[PDB]
Write a protein that binds this ligand. Structure first.
Ligand SMILES: *CC(=O)Nc1ccc(Cl)c(S(=O)(=O)NC(C)C)c1
Ligand SMILES: *CC(=O)Nc1ccc(Cl)c(S(=O)(=O)NC(C)C)c1
Lengths: 239, 239
């Protein structure tokens, strides 16, 4: 547990990544980094995790990523990869086993076009956590419903349980983290008019990879309380 | 010339794309669509062009792209691909010849990470064309200089003339359209403190593909005057 404690301002710069492993600079409750971690687990990629204290960042972390954001991958050759969707594509291409993206160019384009249908949602979740009263919350639920309707149409047309087909694939892992957070944000009723999307969330929670990385609502709550109190201890909630 | 006239509200829906060709729904002065057209030319892909009147769009165009935006690719099989970066990647993968993206996963990730360094620029160009006085223009030039410094660092580190190496590649074509438009927006002085980026623009203009698709400043001006006058005739400037 204590192994997972974040590195913050003053921490020593970490040593090289061992041959045979890849390193992720992550934060345990960051949904962007959770994308990368789902791919690492889904493909069985040996890796180590460094958690960054995103309230109290080490100055050395800007040498990993000039933007100072997670996720970041670093390999034994010293190559650095950042931006969540880019880290996922890299892992899918660089490592053996189950291809999470289709080989077919059109079917891969389709997965990126769905990602684009989804692209407003992270900004709404970012706005949501700030909402202050029942009126802002009503408005926020209607904004989620309009984005969710777009995703419902994809499942309607394909009649597959997942966005890439009847098997879970990269697009499902790239959107999952924000759906994971919906219960805890009390935004669960925004899937009520999207029945295929509501079944999709149940299917996802049964996925071995999703289940293995799922955080309890309790744990996500304890985090958000500290993040919103502006606490340097938020990222190390529970230890 | 008259062949290039846009299809607008009331136009007939077009027929199927012939086997052996791909169709681009474009607009002659749209820098996002220009990305797709540079890739089509660079790879020697036989294609047809339908220009959309983006002030006076055909209702049938929403059947091509629910977002109602160009560019859109449509092939003989009836598959539809939209979002500029996605159309480019698709063409690079689906068609033979010169790979504009590297095969190496890391080097491909590097091209996407540069694209991300560039990602503020289209929004600034969108804000720029609206600027109203010498004060807004001073402020706008400093915003361009801060983004251009990020791109200068990539060329500094690589000591290559192009963003992907010493040969022009996909990343150069994906960013070029906004640099093409800088003279006409009177934002040419924003490359003065970025000497490697200023040489990069000269190298680009010598590229056979870039040169073949370059629009005169006169032509871009006539367009922007009508776009800003809110004219349904903007997209068909000069015919
Ligand atoms: C890594 C990470 O937590 N990134 C991040 C960036 C912006 C936003 Cl909005 C989020 S969040 O959707 O979890 N909301 C909070 C503001 C952190 C996460
Ligand atoms: C296709 C096209 O012209 N797209 C587009 C979208 C937004 C913006 Cl801002 C532009 S522009 O940068 O050329 N500026 C004008 C507002 C059209 C283009």
């Amino acid at each position: 547990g204590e192994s997972a404690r974040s590195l913050g301002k003053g921490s020593a710069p970490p040593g090289p990544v061992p041959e045979g492993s890849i390193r992720i600079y992550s934060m345990r409750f960051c949904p962007f980094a959770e994308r990368t971690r789902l791919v690492l687990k889904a493909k069985g990629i040996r890796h180590e995790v460094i958690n960054i204290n995103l309230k109290n960042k080490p100055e050395w972390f800007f040498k990993k990523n000039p933007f100072g954001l997670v996720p970041v991958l670093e390999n034994s050759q010293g190559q650095l990869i950042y931006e969540s969707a880019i880290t996922c594509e890299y892992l899918d291409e660089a490592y053996p086993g189950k291809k999470l993206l289709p080989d077919d160019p059109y079917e891969k384009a389709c997965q990126k076009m769905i990602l684009e249908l989804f692209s407003k949602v992270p900004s709404l979740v970012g706005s949501f956590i700030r909402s202050q009263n029942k009126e802002d919350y009503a408005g926020l639920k209607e904004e989620f419903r309009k984005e969710f309707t777009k995703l419902e149409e994809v499942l309607t047309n394909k009649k597959t349980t997942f966005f890439g087909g009847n098997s879970i694939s990269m697009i499902d892992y790239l959107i999952w983290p924000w759906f994971e957070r919906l219960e805890a944000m009390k935004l669960n009723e925004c899937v009520d008019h999207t029945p295929k999307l509501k079944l999709w969330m149940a299917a996802m929670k049964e996925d071995p990879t999703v289940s293995a990385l799922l955080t309890s609502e309790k744990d996500w709550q304890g985090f958000l309380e500290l993040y919103l109190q502006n606490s340097p201890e938020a990222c190390d909630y529970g230890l």
